[PDB]
Design an enzyme around this catalytic site. Sequence first.
Site, PDB file in Angstrom:
ATOM      1  N   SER A 231     -47.304  76.008  37.611  1.00 44.85           N
ATOM      2  CA  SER A 231     -48.136  75.073  36.861  1.00 44.85           C
ATOM      3  C   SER A 231     -47.368  73.810  36.486  1.00 44.85           C
ATOM      4  O   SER A 231     -47.960  72.728  36.403  1.00 44.85           O
ATOM      5  CB  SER A 231     -48.707  75.743  35.608  1.00 44.85           C
ATOM      6  OG  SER A 231     -47.688  76.114  34.710  1.00 44.85           O
TER       7      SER A 231
ATOM      8  N   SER B 246     -57.776  76.294  32.000  1.00 47.11           N
ATOM      9  CA  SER B 246     -56.990  75.254  31.352  1.00 47.11           C
ATOM     10  C   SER B 246     -56.770  74.035  32.238  1.00 47.11           C
ATOM     11  O   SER B 246     -56.384  72.977  31.725  1.00 47.11           O
ATOM     12  CB  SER B 246     -55.640  75.828  30.910  1.00 47.11           C
ATOM     13  OG  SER B 246     -55.070  76.630  31.930  1.00 47.11           O
ATOM     14  N   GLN B 247     -56.999  74.155  33.551  1.00 46.98           N
ATOM     15  CA  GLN B 247     -56.686  73.056  34.458  1.00 46.98           C
ATOM     16  C   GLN B 247     -57.629  71.870  34.300  1.00 46.98           C
ATOM     17  O   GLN B 247     -57.254  70.760  34.682  1.00 46.98           O
ATOM     18  CB  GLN B 247     -56.698  73.539  35.912  1.00 46.98           C
ATOM     19  CG  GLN B 247     -55.315  73.921  36.432  1.00 46.98           C
ATOM     20  CD  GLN B 247     -55.326  74.356  37.886  1.00 46.98           C
ATOM     21  OE1 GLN B 247     -55.527  73.544  38.783  1.00 46.98           O
ATOM     22  NE2 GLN B 247     -55.115  75.648  38.124  1.00 46.98           N
TER      23      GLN B 247
ATOM     24  N   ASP C 234     -46.235  87.706  27.266  1.00 46.20           N
ATOM     25  CA  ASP C 234     -46.060  88.096  28.666  1.00 46.20           C
ATOM     26  C   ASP C 234     -44.731  88.821  28.906  1.00 46.20           C
ATOM     27  O   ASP C 234     -44.582  89.479  29.947  1.00 46.20           O
ATOM     28  CB  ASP C 234     -46.157  86.872  29.572  1.00 46.20           C
ATOM     29  CG  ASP C 234     -47.613  86.380  29.753  1.00 46.20           C
ATOM     30  OD1 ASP C 234     -48.558  87.112  29.400  1.00 46.20           O
ATOM     31  OD2 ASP C 234     -47.820  85.257  30.253  1.00 46.20           O
TER      32      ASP C 234
ATOM     33  N   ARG D 217     -46.504  92.282  36.038  1.00 45.52           N
ATOM     34  CA  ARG D 217     -45.497  92.439  34.989  1.00 45.52           C
ATOM     35  C   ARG D 217     -45.148  93.904  34.718  1.00 45.52           C
ATOM     36  O   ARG D 217     -44.032  94.190  34.293  1.00 45.52           O
ATOM     37  CB  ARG D 217     -45.966  91.761  33.704  1.00 45.52           C
ATOM     38  CG  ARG D 217     -46.460  90.330  33.950  1.00 45.52           C
ATOM     39  CD  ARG D 217     -45.940  89.338  32.921  1.00 45.52           C
ATOM     40  NE  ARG D 217     -46.361  87.997  33.323  1.00 45.52           N
ATOM     41  CZ  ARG D 217     -45.610  87.165  34.041  1.00 45.52           C
ATOM     42  NH1 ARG D 217     -44.385  87.526  34.425  1.00 45.52           N
ATOM     43  NH2 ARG D 217     -46.085  85.985  34.393  1.00 45.52           N
TER      44      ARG D 217
ATOM     45  N   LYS E 142     -48.590  88.231  42.922  1.00 45.29           N
ATOM     46  CA  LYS E 142     -49.397  87.380  42.055  1.00 45.29           C
ATOM     47  C   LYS E 142     -48.593  86.223  41.477  1.00 45.29           C
ATOM     48  O   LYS E 142     -49.148  85.142  41.262  1.00 45.29           O
ATOM     49  CB  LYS E 142     -50.023  88.201  40.931  1.00 45.29           C
ATOM     50  CG  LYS E 142     -51.069  89.209  41.449  1.00 45.29           C
ATOM     51  CD  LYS E 142     -51.668  90.031  40.326  1.00 45.29           C
ATOM     52  CE  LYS E 142     -52.816  90.897  40.837  1.00 45.29           C
ATOM     53  NZ  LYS E 142     -53.706  91.336  39.726  1.00 45.29           N
TER      54      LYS E 142
END
Length: 400
Positions: free
Chosen positions: A7, A152-153, A288, A360, A385
């Site tokens: 990002s 959010s983009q 995260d 994760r 991912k």
Amino acid sequence: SLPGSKSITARALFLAAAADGVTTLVRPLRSDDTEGFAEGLVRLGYRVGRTPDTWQVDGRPQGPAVAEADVYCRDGATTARFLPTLAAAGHGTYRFDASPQMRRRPLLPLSRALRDLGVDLRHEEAEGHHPLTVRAAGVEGGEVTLDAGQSSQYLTALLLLGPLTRQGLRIRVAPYVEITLAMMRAFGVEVAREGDVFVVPPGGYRATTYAIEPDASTASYFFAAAALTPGAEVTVPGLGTGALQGDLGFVDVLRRMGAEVSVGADATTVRGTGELRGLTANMRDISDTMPTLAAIAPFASAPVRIEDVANTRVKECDRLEACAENLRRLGVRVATGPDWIEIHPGPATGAQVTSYGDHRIVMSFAVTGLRVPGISFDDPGCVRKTFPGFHEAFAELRRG
Ligand SMILES: [K+]
């Protein structure tokens, strides 16, 4: 060498294209999406030079050079949203399309906002989708109300557009937004927030040399491996004191457990000391990395209690329950509550981890496997991912 943040690379490519001067991006992420972005920029008449380490972009404050173009956005979500935005601020006729699979991902909040702002944008098939055509003549600016309470983009695209408009923007509507504002500051623009309105000034951007941070969430697994291993050292260049990503704060937890942690101006080093002390950690703002801590807690000196992590339960899998379930399968005692997990150290035995398809969970319990033989995963490919080469990089860490 850990990969750059996806990002951050995306925002930086927009800023490099739009600024006044030649921008140098250091260590950007190379993916199919960023490759298509670069290709689209070249099709639009921007000069893009690349080495294995740096990309060089001649900024165009008034948008694409060519008067007309067909731009293929491939499979990349950033390319599909940011390139039409850049073009809309310029002057010409631009026909966008995407792969048959990416056509299925609309961008209606962004295209509605651009048309509210006076852009002649037309969807050739369904509203919101590629293919779409922009007959660009700049953007005047002023007020706009965005209805993007999800992805959010769209807000970030409008924020990035603001300084290219003639009068600036007043955008009426999260860590993602603070990263966008900090990057705009590195390119010479201060944004003010008044209640629900972001106030973005006109006047464009100033080109610079901008280093892309390695993904700090990805870095947490390599930092944790070092903290767990006495005498081992891991340094991640590009993550330093001024880092934009909040998950670098995971190393402050490792320091509280007794690892030697040095956050330099341009790099961070973690060194294992053999001391791994239990603690209570509020991980609300670095959630995260909650699984990263859960997976080294079996080796701590005392209980590890992770608090204020309601948010981890509402990911695509409940990560609190997934950590507890896998730790229990390894023989570790675990207690849980609505928004907390408490891990009680003790001997662990290898087993197959239930990933729930969560990258994760796999990456975190890979760290556990440094000390517990016989750990496997039901779905090792889900690391793709966020880090397609994770298993190779971690194997290399293991050998070192
Ligand atoms: K309008």
